[PDB]
Each structure stands twice: as C-alpha cells, then as structure tokens.
DNA sequence: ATCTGTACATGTACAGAT
DNA sequence: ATCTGTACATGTACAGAT
DNA sequence: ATCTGTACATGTACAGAT
DNA sequence: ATCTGTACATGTACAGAT
C-alpha cells in the first residue's frame, strides 16, 4: 500500500549500468564527433560548446537509456533581443562577422541557421560507418535536430543549437524562479548569473527562451538542507516522485493521441512549483512516497482544471492556456489520471 | 543582558563608512605599485579576509585584513619537520631563490621595502608603518583617520594545486555544509603566507575557505537571509571573541592566545551541532555556554586542532605553556559562574 | 626558440551492482 | 555496507603552429 | 591589462506594528 | 520588549568596454 509497490515501479523504472555504458559510448562517440566537425574551417558554428541536459543528465531518465539531450552552444555578444508580442518566452534577436550568411536586416533568421546547422550535421553523419545512425525528418517548429541510433537497441539524441548570451536576464524572468524559501536568494542570485539562452522556435525568425541548464543545477541541488541525498545526509524522493509523474504520462501518452499536446515538460514545471510550496526536506520523506506523489497528482489535476501552469522560469507564460492545449484534451487527461489514481495504477503494470 | 552587549559591541554604519573610504585609498595606492613597475610582485590581487569582511568584527572598524595574493606556477611542497602546516617551497622571482628555495624572509622584505617606500609618498591621509614583528607574515599598517585604524597587508602565494596531503582529513563539513560543498571548496587554490615556524618557512592560509564558511554557515540554504530564519552562530563567535578580547586586554599571562584559537574552536563547535535549530536566536544563552564549555574542555585536554590540518594542535605544550591553558581556564570559569562582569566594564 | 587549442590527468558525487 | 562506471570540473602537457 | 556598471548579498538605523 | 518594512551603506562577482 504505503512505501511498496511504487517501490516496486521504481525498480522497473531503474537504468542498468550495462544498458547505461552501451549507450552512453556509442552516444559519445556520435556527439564528439559532431561537435569536432562545427570547429573546422569557415564554419558558422565554430567555436560551439557542448552542454549535456534534460532528463538523463539529471538522474531521472526511466525504463531505458534511449533518448539524450545535448545543446551545441554559440556565444553571441552584441545582441538586442525583442519581446514577440508579450508573450514572455518568445524573441527576435538582432545586433566581418560569421552568422552575417543567416542576418535579415539587423535580425538573425532562427530557421536560416537551423538549416545550416542541420545541414552540416546531416553531411557528418554520412561519414559516420561505424555506428548505424541516421538524422530524422524534421518537424516544422522544432528547435532539434533527431539523431536515431540503432546499437541495435533504438536511442534518440536531440541536438539543440543555441545562442548563448551573458547579459542579465530578460526582463519577463524577473519574478520567476521563485526558490527564494526553498534554495535561498544565494543561489538564485548565482543562477541568474549564468547566461541564458535562446533556441529556434515573423513565424521563421522567432527564438525561445531556455533554461536547461539551470533546471539542471535545481535537480541536482534539489534540497534546502545542503546534505540532501549526499552520502552523509537524509534521502529524500523528490527525483523518485518526479520519475512516476513522468511514467504515468509515458504509459498513457503511448496509449491515446488525444495526450499529444501533453509532453514531459509540463510534468517538471509543476513539480517545480511543488518543490517551491513544499520547501522542507521532511515534506519529501522517503517513507511518504505515496503521500508524496498523491499531492503532486493532486496538484498537477488542479492545474488542468484551472487551465493554468506557470512557467517556473517565464511567470505570465500558462503552458495550459486555452491558446496551447484544448480544454478536451486537458479534460481527457484529468479523467486518466483520477481513474489511475483511484484504481490502484493498473498502468503501472502495462506492457 | 547578552542582547545588551551584542548591541554594544555592534558596529556603527557611520563608523564602518568613514574608516572603509580611508583603508580602501590606502589599499587600492599600495596594489597599483606592485603591478605598475618592474616589480617582482607585478600580478598580486586583492583579497579580503578575517573578520570585518566575514561580518564579525565587533566594538569598533578598526582592524582590517588584505592578502595581495601571487599566483606562482609549478612549485614544490616539502613538508617542514611533519608541523602540517609548515613548508619549503622549491620549483621575476629569482631575486628570492636560494639553493632551490624560495625564501619567506628574502621575498616578504621587498615587498615589505615596497609599502614602506609608497606609504611615504602619502600626504593626504596619516598613515605609518608599524615596526616589524620578527617571524610575522604581516606588514601592519596604523592610520589615525583621527581614530586608530591597522590594516594587515600579508604576502601570499597561491598554488592550484591538489591541497597538501596534510590536510586530506581536514575540513570536516561533510554532514553539516556537504560533500559537494566540500569538494568544491579544495577546488579552489590554497595558500602560503610567510610566517616563519625558520627564515624560509611558509605556513598555509586558508583564509578564503573560512570567508565562504562564515556567510555560508547554514546546514539550510537560506540560514540568515531574507526568505530563511535567523540563527546565532555569529553572535556567539563575537561573544566569545569578545570574552577573550577583555581578558587579554587585561592579563598578559594570556598573550599566547589569539583570536583564531577562538575561530576555530568555533568551527568546531558548528561541526558537532551542524543543525540550523540548535543555533535558534532564543537560545542564544545556551548557545554562548555550551561553546565556553567546549573551549574549556579543549583547555583541560590541551587539544585544540587546527580545522584544516588535523594533526596540528593549537593547543600543544610547544605552542602554549600549561600554566596560560590553566590561567585562561579559571578566569573564564570566573566570568561564567558570575554572570560575566567583565562584558559591563566599557 | 616560444606559444596554445586540444585533450589527458585527477578527484569525487551520484547511483547501480553486489 | 562496499565497490564501481559515468559525468564533470579543473589543472596541466604538448604536437603543431608561430 | 584595467576599469566602470550593474545587481543584490551582507550589514546598520529607525518607525510603526505587534 | 520584539518584529517588519524601508532607507542607507559597503563589499563583491563578473560582463562589457577599452
Ligand atoms: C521549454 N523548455 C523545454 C520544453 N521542452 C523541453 N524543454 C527542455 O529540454 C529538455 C529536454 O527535453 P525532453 O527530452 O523533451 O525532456 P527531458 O527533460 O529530457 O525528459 P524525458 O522525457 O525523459 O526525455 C528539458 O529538460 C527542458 O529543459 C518546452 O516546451 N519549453
Ligand atoms: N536541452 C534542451 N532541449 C530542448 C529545449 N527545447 C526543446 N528541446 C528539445 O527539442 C525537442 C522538441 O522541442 P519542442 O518543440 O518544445 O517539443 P515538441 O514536441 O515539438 O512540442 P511543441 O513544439 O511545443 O509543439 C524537445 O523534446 C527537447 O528534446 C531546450 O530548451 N533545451
Ligand atoms: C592560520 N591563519 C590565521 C592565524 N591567525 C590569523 N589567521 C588568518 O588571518 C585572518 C585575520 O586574522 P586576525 O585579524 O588576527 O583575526 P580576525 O579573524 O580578523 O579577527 P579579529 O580579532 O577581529 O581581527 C583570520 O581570520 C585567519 O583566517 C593563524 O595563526 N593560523
Ligand atoms: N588574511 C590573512 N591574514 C593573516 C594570515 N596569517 C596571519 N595573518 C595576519 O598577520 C597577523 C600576525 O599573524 P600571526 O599568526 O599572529 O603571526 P605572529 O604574530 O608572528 O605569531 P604569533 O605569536 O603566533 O601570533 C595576524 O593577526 C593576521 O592579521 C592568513 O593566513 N590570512
Ligand atoms: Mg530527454
Ligand atoms: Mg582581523
Ligand atoms: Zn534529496
Ligand atoms: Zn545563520
């Protein structure tokens, strides 16, 4: 009832150092590989930076070591940004000089410089006999380039190009991150002052705003006792209740299309948000992980039926606007989610 | 009561104003010199340490601590006589060689010679050069703003540098700041800064770790700021410092004892009680008093290790005789059982 | 001769294996 | 409870450039 | 190789609220 | 007496310019 059974799920949910070392050397191999090719030559991208993010960097990757998430990370000084229209998370950028073959008139195309780093890529990849690995059909607004790798198990790798930009934040950020209670207004402060980025989304030349980076400091530095997980302090399952939410969407988002506007992302801003409500380390006791995961199922039904979560990062920006996901689909959702929780999570056992 | 003296000894924003703007032309004059020329400490930075910049310093700013630090290349340690924190050092500079060895004495009298030559060129501000103290690190600065000021302008090499093996077992945060935090911190360089154990000795700094330490001293994140609760650590290291300040001011069978005695037994004390609870601002007393028992224990033991370097007993029969351990022993047992009479004398 | 972008060398938190 | 592979931060060597 | 500009932490000082 | 909110002050990390 209580601690088991999702203890249960959480040790099918557990990579294998054997599967882990497979992929991860193959991976490395591609990645390394491809970021050598961005520094030859008269190349636009030279000078490129690797950044390793999302879930398997932060420790909560599920089920399989099959899907990688690598920023390839340009800095570019002078740059302007302009707010696209209030919306918070979206921007133009404007300024011998490189990126001068994607400008437009002070603004930099965000697709002009997608294709010419998908282009080079996909050229690279050509040359690649080791390993059988190919580069997906792209989707139209899609910041990612998809590596497919069959090692002969299947591992996705999204190559995410992005602007690297060193000045303070911009201005629609100001009132996020709200880990002031929880993480202290330190560590905010040193967060902000890292840079902040920009991927591909006046539809072609839009960027979006990201935080990968500072999503994964937070997963990593996650308590507000400094020795949260640490081999002389308390475990907490902060992570364990993040890798069932994720789960529970994973089962049922392969089950019915009506969930394809639902993606992992909104699974972590909300427990973003309840880390922040639930600041203290013994409101995440290991012992409580039912509890603990009830709340957040709990919160995250009231954030479909209230149409409403926040951004952490971009406060005005409701990725459960009516604009973004159809009240249909949020309703939907709602529904597979009270029926799990009241029936024992048969899903859990799927497949 | 113990509130009554922490408002005493608080310093004043008018005070810390005026002295600041006076130490920081000195200060920011004397680092031009040594990058402007062909000096051999052409590189030093600043780097401000103890307790007036770890908001610590108590009664009035009239004390101030600046390392010019000078990052070197590849150097070599060889261990002093198994001291800990005692070294040769070996490998511009080669005015201070030796057979090999860089010399502490040879290499802290020019830069000694330096400031002294700078600070005669300074006519807008009263301000001297103390008579030095053999086998110091320090060059003392006195400047009478009219009122009394030192600042200690102390020499120091930084190596980056595994830390010495010395102090492996040292700084023992980990169940209070963290292994990351820990780990994170011996990424940084270490220090030498030449006070002679004789005459091309060096002896490890770690300044810039117990600056981190004290404005980060919580086991949560947010002890002491503006989202977080309030705690006392700091408060019962000025009680204490100022407990020791008023007793050396008036024994001077106590002139063995400093205040970095009081310093690290208190990183000591919040190791042992590495909770943010246990240092709740209403239990200040208990607080002061079971660190004076802690500092009276490590008196009758005769065992006050150094926090980074742990073989290195502040306390040994070498460094203090057993009659100033015993001396400081009663007169602080005095003080406690007495309701601390010597905190009202002004 | 000296300089330097690249990659190795070192150390350890994290978390899976045992 | 200990042992151990990957990821990562920082320090340092050096073939190839200058 | 040096310096200002910016942002916000750490403080002190004090009135009004509690 | 203590707490909370605002005003006032210094110290410090680091971007951007030079
Ligand atoms: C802002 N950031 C996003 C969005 N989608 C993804 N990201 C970022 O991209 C990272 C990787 O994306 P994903 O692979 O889709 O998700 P993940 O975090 O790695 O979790 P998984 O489903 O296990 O892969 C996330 O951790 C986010 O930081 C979005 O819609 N808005
Ligand atoms: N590391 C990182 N990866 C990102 C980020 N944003 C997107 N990605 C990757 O690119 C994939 C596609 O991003 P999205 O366009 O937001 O996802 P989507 O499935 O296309 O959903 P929508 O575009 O919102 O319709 C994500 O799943 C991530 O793997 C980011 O900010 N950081
Ligand atoms: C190692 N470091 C020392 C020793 N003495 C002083 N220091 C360091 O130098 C800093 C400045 O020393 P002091 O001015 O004497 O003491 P302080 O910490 O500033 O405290 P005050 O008495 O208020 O001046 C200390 O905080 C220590 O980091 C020592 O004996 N061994
Ligand atoms: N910032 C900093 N200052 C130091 C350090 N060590 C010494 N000092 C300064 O130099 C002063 C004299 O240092 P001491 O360690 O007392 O040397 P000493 O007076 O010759 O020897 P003692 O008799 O043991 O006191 C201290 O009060 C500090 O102000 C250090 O490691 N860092
Ligand atoms: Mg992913
Ligand atoms: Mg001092
Ligand atoms: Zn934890
Ligand atoms: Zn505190």
């Not at 207004?185 to 989304?201: A, C, G, I, M, S």
């Amino acid at each position: 009832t209580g601690p088991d059974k999702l203890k249960k799920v959480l040790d099918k949910l557990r990579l294998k150092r054997k599967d882990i070392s497979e992929a991860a050397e193959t991976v490395n191999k591609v990645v390394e590989r491809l970021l050598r090719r961005m520094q030859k030559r008269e190349s636009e991208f030279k000078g490129v930076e690797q950044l390793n993010t999302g879930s398997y960097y932060e420790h909560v990757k599920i089920s399989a070591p099959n899907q990688f998430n690598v920023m390839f990370k340009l800095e570019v000084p002078r740059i302007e940004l302009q707010e696209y229209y209030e919306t918070g998370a979206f921007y133009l950028v404007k300024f011998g000089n490189p990126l001068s073959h994607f400008l437009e008139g002070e603004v930099l195309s965000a697709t002009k410089m997608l294709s010419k780093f998908r282009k080079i890529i996909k050229e690279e990849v050509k040359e690649i006999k080791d390993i059988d690995v190919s580069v997906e059909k792209e989707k139209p607004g899609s910041p990612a380039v998809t590596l497919l790798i069959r090692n002969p198990e299947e591992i996705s790798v999204d190559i995410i190009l992005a602007l690297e930009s060193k000045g303070s934040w911009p201005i629609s950020t100001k009132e996020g991150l709200p880990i002031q209670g929880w993480l202290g207004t330190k560590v905010r402060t040193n967060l902000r002052r890292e840079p902040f980025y920009l991927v591909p989304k006046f539809q072609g030349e839009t960027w979006r705003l990201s935080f990968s980076h500072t999503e994964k400091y937070i997963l990593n530095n996650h308590g507000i006792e400094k020795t949260c997980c640490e081999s002389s302090g308390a475990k907490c399952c902060r992570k364990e209740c993040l890798k069932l939410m994720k789960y529970l969407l994973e089962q049922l988002k392969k089950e019915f299309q009506e969930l394809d506007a639902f993606c992992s992302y909104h699974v972590k801003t909300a427990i973003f948000h309840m880390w922040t409500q639930d600041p203290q380390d013994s409101q995440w006791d290991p012992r409580n992980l039912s509890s603990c995961f009830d709340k957040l199922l709990a919160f995250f039904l009231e954030c479909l039926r209230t149409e409403k979560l926040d951004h952490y990062f971009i406060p005005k920006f409701n990725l459960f606007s009516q604009e973004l996901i159809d009240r249909k689909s949020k309703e939907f959702l709602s529904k597979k989610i009270e029926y799990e929780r009241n029936n024992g999570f048969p899903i859990f056992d799927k497949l």
